[PDB]
């Protein structure tokens, strides 16, 4: 009722902005970047477990993925120290 | 069979990197950024069409959201001209 | 100020349920479904605009995408009819 | 440029559906359901930690909330046993 297309734009925006207005407001944003030949930690861990003999289990395939990052043979896409499976990586020099 | 834990680390990585290695790759990644009080264009459009009388179809609500961006009352999170429902937005100076 | 871990649980819940309690309460919910090989309308238009010659502008790619939905070559994941770039689709029968 | 507006529609779609076509695809989707008076598990835990006395930290608030689901005071909107902060709930019989 109380707001319509005749209300000034600035006031409608302040209404949408006020606490408890109804608007979904969260403390994050997801941006899509086009980086050819990237991959997830989980895809590296998979590939090593299934293609490289001698791992007693998957957690050792994950430690090996981790040493590849330390060695700079894969690289983080934004600056991070520690390996995670959920993060995206690209290849180092080679 | 031909790769195991005894193999050269760099050689194992160059095999993973080759064409047709089986390594799941693709050309896009998603980054999460912590922006306080950010919101989706689609939710702005949901809020308007739900709370502001005078819109005959949802498209007039999207066009109004477009006008809010032109006016600087909402703002893009990254350098972009035109409005989209899939992008993330913050409020301007109010 | 005067609710604590010693208060009646049902009374706490009631306090949180009252008007103006400050709990975020809203007429919506969002659900994650696992659907292998699902794609967004906007990615279909993008694919068609970049790979199929003869689209003078991007809106013509959109209308073609709508004509895929209408012919059943792609399918909405819920009960809708009209094409939207924001919804998720899957492939129809292609055998 | 082997495909145009002249090509068979079914053949264009089979192209798009082929391994390595370039079409961006995913194994998850998000759906909006209109449900009156629904709230996020993390919003309940926040509301408890801020307005109820005697929680030395946030994990004790999370546990109380999980207790609230067990007693039937809040309820899951999809059949799930256990409590989780990213799932949606409604009020029970009050």
Numbering used by the authors:
A (entry chain B), B (entry chain A), D (entry chain D): 415 to 508
C (entry chain C): 415 to 509
From the paper:
Purifying lipoyl-tagged DEP (Lip-DEP416–511) by size exclusion chromatography (SEC), we observed two main peaks, corresponding to monomers and dimers (discussed later), in addition to a higher mass species. Thus, we crystallized the monomeric and dimeric fractions and determined three structures at 1.84–2.06 Å resolution. Remarkably, each structure exhibits a swapped dimer, regardless of the crystal form: namely, molecule A (turquoise) donates H1 to the H2–H3 core of molecule B (light turquoise) by extending loop 1, and vice versa. Thus, two DEP cores are connected by an extended β sheet, composed of two antiparallel β strands (each made up by a β1β2 tandem) that interact with each other through backbone atoms of residues 442–447. This dimer-specific interface is based on six new hydrogen bonds, which may bias the equilibrium toward the domain-swapped configuration. Interestingly, the solvent-exposed “underside” of the connecting β sheet presents a hydrophobic patch, made up of a triad of hydrophobic amino acids (M443, L445, and I447) located at the DEP finger tip of the monomer. In each crystal, two DEP dimers associate with each other through this hydrophobic patch, thus linking four DEP cores into a cross-shaped tetramer. Presumably, the high protein concentration in the crystallization drops favored the tetramerization of DEP. The first condition is met by the clathrin-coated pits in which multiple Dishevelled molecules are juxtaposed, potentially reaching a very high local concentration which could be sufficient to induce DEP dimerization. Thus, they mimic the conditions during DEP crystallization, which inexorably induced domain swapping.
Wnt signalosome assembly relies on reversible head-to-tail polymerization by the N-terminal DIX domain of Dishevelled (Schwarz-Romond et al., 2007), which enables this hub to transduce Wnt signals to cytoplasmic effectors. In addition to DIX, Dishevelled has a PDZ domain (Post-synaptic density protein-95, Disc large tumor suppressor, Zonula occludens-1) and a DEP domain (Dishevelled, Egl-10, and Pleckstrin), separated by long flexible linkers peppered with phosphorylation sites, and also a binding motif for the AP2 clathrin adaptor (Yu et al., 2010). Here, we use structural analysis, as well as biophysical and cell-based assays, to show that the DEP domain of Dishevelled undergoes a conformational switch, from monomeric to swapped dimer, to trigger DIX-dependent polymerization and signaling to β-catenin. This occurs in two steps: binding of monomeric DEP to Frizzled followed by DEP domain swapping triggered by its high local concentration upon Wnt-induced recruitment into clathrin-coated pits.
